[PDB]
Ligand SMILES: [Co+2]
Ligand SMILES: [Co+2]
Ligand SMILES: [Mg+2]
Ligand SMILES: [Mg+2]
Ligand SMILES: [Mg+2]
């Protein structure tokens with residue numbers, strides 16, 4: 001059902017934390033993923049949540065400004081960080097399952113300013129030499145653009161507030177929280193479209 | 202209220218043709234830009250159209266498979282190609298005009314699988330060392346995502362047909378034609394949201 005809605009695409013919400021803006025050279029530090037489901041009523045809602053702290057890859061650059069921004073101490077002994085390979089492999093495992101079960105044929109990343117998270121995910125996958133990536137190699141569902149249309153807002157915090165959702169700046173910029181808000185935001189935009197009779201055609 | 206609609210963003214539709222998928226190493230070959238306007242009743246439609254054939258930058262890589270796809274012959278001196286600098290500077294001049302004329306703050310690129318065209322534009326701007334870029338450095342309005350939501354389709358041709366638009370595959374893959382269809386597609390998605398009472402919010 002989730003797969004008739006988006007021509008076979010299985011939407012998965014993704015947020016990453018990084019040690020910079022350069023996907024090829026800057027450390028991936030954290031990643032959360034939230035799969036979605038469609039109920040009998042045809043409404044969209046979050047399904048499964050995965051979250052991993054990621055160890056900076058060997059040779060990775062780290063910008064203090066980024067660390068200052070996300071508050072991540074890449075040296076905290078009990079971060080419980082895993083390898084980029086480990087995080088993506090575990091996420092890909094869940095995504096692949098959710099795909100076959102719903103009739104989808106490929107995953108698509110839902111993310112806020114999606115090019116960012118997509119570039120980092122693809123770079124991490126490259127690093128680890130992962131051959132089986134369930135995510136579309138270039139297409140994404142950018143919630144910034146989607147909110148621009150739906151809410152006249154492109155900033156995540158502002159978009160959520162405008163959508164009637166709660167948003168907590170003190171929790172903001174953490175992978176789990178941002179992913180969850182982005183997931184709720186995406187479901188709301190889709191549900192609102194259906195609500196107003198935009199869907200089905 | 203064009204810049205009331207998108208928190209100050211001035212949406213400009215862009216399509217590029219290239220000699221490959223690598224924005225840093227593959228030649229930019231063509232670029233077309235379509236600005237938008239809003240009428241007094243709040244409806245969105247295309248405004249100004251610009252189009253440039255672009256000369257492959259010095260050292261640029263050319264993928265035959267790309268040239269096979271877009272039918273571009275980078276060697277035909279009849280093509281009338283200009284430098285990447287020339288194309289962007291001319292486009293930027295028109296965009297910069299439109300912004301400070303509608304109370305806008307910045308331009309935002311509208312494009313189909315926008316990350317692609319945005320990467321190529323930014324790469325071209327950087328090679329030419331352009332210092333005044335009116336386009337937002339990372340935000341875009343991807344019509345693939347927007348059509349996914351509005352039409353349940355992510356492929357340009359399919360999204361257009363589903364939207365009720367005419368689409369002609371024999372004209373597809375030309376910068377001018379693709380940009381125009383993309384502009385019409387984007388306007389229709391925005392206008393349809395308004396028609397359905399999705400906008401304004403109150
Ligand atoms: Co990594
Ligand atoms: Co160039
Ligand atoms: Mg983020
Ligand atoms: Mg964050
Ligand atoms: Mg294109």
Ligand SMILES: [Mg+2]
Nearest residue numbers: 374375376379
């Ligand atoms: Mg084209």
